[PDB]
Amino acid sequence: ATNFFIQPITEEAEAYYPPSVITNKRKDLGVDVYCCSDLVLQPGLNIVRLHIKVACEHMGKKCGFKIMARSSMCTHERLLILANGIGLIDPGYVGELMLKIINLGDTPVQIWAKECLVQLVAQGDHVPDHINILKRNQIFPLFAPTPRGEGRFGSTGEAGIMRT
Amino acid sequence: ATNFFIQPITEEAEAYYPPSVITNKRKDLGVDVYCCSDLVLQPGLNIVRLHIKVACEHMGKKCGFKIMARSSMCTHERLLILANGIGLIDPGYVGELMLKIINLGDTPVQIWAKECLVQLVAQGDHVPDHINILKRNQIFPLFAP
Amino acid sequence: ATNFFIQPITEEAEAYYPPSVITNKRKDLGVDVYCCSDLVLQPGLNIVRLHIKVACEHMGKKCGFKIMARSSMCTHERLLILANGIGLIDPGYVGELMLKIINLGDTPVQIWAKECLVQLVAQGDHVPDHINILKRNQIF
Ligand SMILES: O=c1ccn([C@H]2C[C@H](O)[C@@H](COP(=O)(O)NP(=O)(O)OP(=O)(O)O)O2)c(=O)[nH]1
Ligand SMILES: O=c1ccn([C@H]2C[C@H](O)[C@@H](COP(=O)(O)NP(=O)(O)OP(=O)(O)O)O2)c(=O)[nH]1
Ligand SMILES: O=c1ccn([C@H]2C[C@H](O)[C@@H](COP(=O)(O)NP(=O)(O)OP(=O)(O)O)O2)c(=O)[nH]1
Ligand SMILES: [Mg+2]
Ligand SMILES: [Mg+2]
Ligand SMILES: [Mg+2]
């Protein structure tokens, strides 16, 4: 069984993420996630919050996942790419999901709160069975402190904490 | 057993996809796919058709797959990237594969029909055993809506 | 069990890859690898050598793996992307790992030998148990 757990962590996320269980009858690989706020992306790098904490679990164990562009993210009107190509979300991450979006155009670009620019894909590309939208308040076991915690964007250092 | 199935759906695709079964003796992860038409890529975003329907099957089940750039897609002469980083193809998708390619340069670039800019990779990165090039003029149930 | 094997093939790599066994207690998906040389990345495409040969094994069999940017590779100061999005390394490949990096900015940019810009990820995204740093030119 492959399940995603999404918890809204702002008032804005609560508009798009009511407490519910979503099934994946279509068997799509990706879980679309909302901007939740109207965005203005400047030419160059933009750091964008997704207003959610996410956990993935496969065969009953907490696992990693990937952030991938939707094919609709990039249009003639909006030349947007994920800076990191895909987002590699480590099993131990329990912070807010963030995006690095490059606007390749010369003009600032507007995104609606209701748009999904990206999709979450389980470690190993397993088709999700259920998407669990958790209550904003609750404590969830899978968000418990880890060695990584909310460490992201070079939190591990230049050498990679991995090191060698 | 991981198998790919490619059906050409245009006469342009029939030039590059003769009916056959390709084995993957080298155990490469990626299945190279042809442009099938010469194209000029304008600076900015370009929509490129791949002229094929594809199915992947793993352990007897229809699965998804991914479209990745070949390391040779991007040269000094042609600063090309996949707009979406990786193409994510759902198990239920039975239409023509399409690419969104960005030309990051100031100047239009020529691609040739016989070039492969991208490669297909099974859901979960399983090494393909066979690539079945299907006859153009059939309705295969694997491609049913 | 999922293990990486890194074999330095230059003296520059030897200086950053002393023989050793790294356990992945954090259970991170990616193995960070050094640039091993100071480099200046020009606007447009830059070919960057990683000074290493790498093997990945899963359940005692040699497998492929992938090269991805670290989320920290791209910043306001260094607008850097992997040209191919992710590098796909076939299980059959035994040569040096190479990068194609695009500087999207108008200005050259400095990268440092002790910097890791990219990470390796096993075929199938398996969490690595061990990273084995081998001796220079030591076979798998
Ligand atoms: O697109 C992303 C990518 C990563 N992340 C988070 C989760 C991930 O576990 C954490 C670390 O990502 P990387 O390991 O891929 N980047 P880096 O190695 O530079 O950061 P760190 O040193 O903290 O591991 O950053 C995002 O929120 N969005
Ligand atoms: O690079 C690609 C990506 C997707 N596709 C096809 C197959 C895929 O299952 C389908 C939808 O892909 P995305 O989820 O990335 N696009 P989006 O979410 O914007 O549209 P849709 O609502 O149809 O999923 O489009 C391509 O042909 N090439
Ligand atoms: O980023 C990369 C990508 C690939 N490689 C290596 C490993 C891989 O097995 C080999 C082939 O890569 P691609 O299949 O993506 N490039 P291409 O298909 O253009 O060349 P080839 O015909 O040699 O496979 O080059 C790298 O060193 N770095
Ligand atoms: Mg979609
Ligand atoms: Mg190849
Ligand atoms: Mg990291």
Numbering used by the authors:
A (entry chain A): 2 to 165
B (entry chain B): 2 to 146
C (entry chain C): 2 to 141
What does the paper say about this structure?
The α,β-bridging oxygen in dUTP was replaced by an imido group to form 2′-deoxyuridine 5′-(α,β-imido) triphosphate (dUPNPP), a nonhydrolyzable substrate analog and potent competitive inhibitor of dUTPase. The aDUT-dUPNPP-Mg2+ complex structure represents the prereaction state of the substrates just after binding to the active site. The crystal of the aDUT-dUPNPP-Mg2+ complex grew in the P212121 space group with one trimer in each asymmetric unit. Fortunately, clear electron density was observed for the remaining C-terminal residues in the aDUT-dUPNPP-Mg2+ complex structure. However, surprisingly, there is no C-terminal β-strand swapping in ASFV dUTPase, and the aDUT-dUPNPP-Mg2+ structure provides definite evidence to support the presence of two-subunit active sites in the trimeric dUTPase. The ASFV dUTPase active site is formed by the following two subunits: one subunit provides catalytic motifs I, II, and IV and the other subunit provides motifs III and V. The C terminus (motif V) of ASFV dUTPase continues to reach the active site of its own subunit instead of reaching the third subunit as seen in a classical dUTPase. When dUTP and Mg2+ enter the active site pocket, the uracil ring forms hydrogen bonds with the main-chain oxygen and nitrogen of Met99, and the resultant hydrogen bonds can recognize and fix the uracil ring by imitating Watson–Crick pairing. The C terminus (motif V) changes to a closed state, closing the active site. Phe154 is conjugated with uracil to further fix the uracil ring.
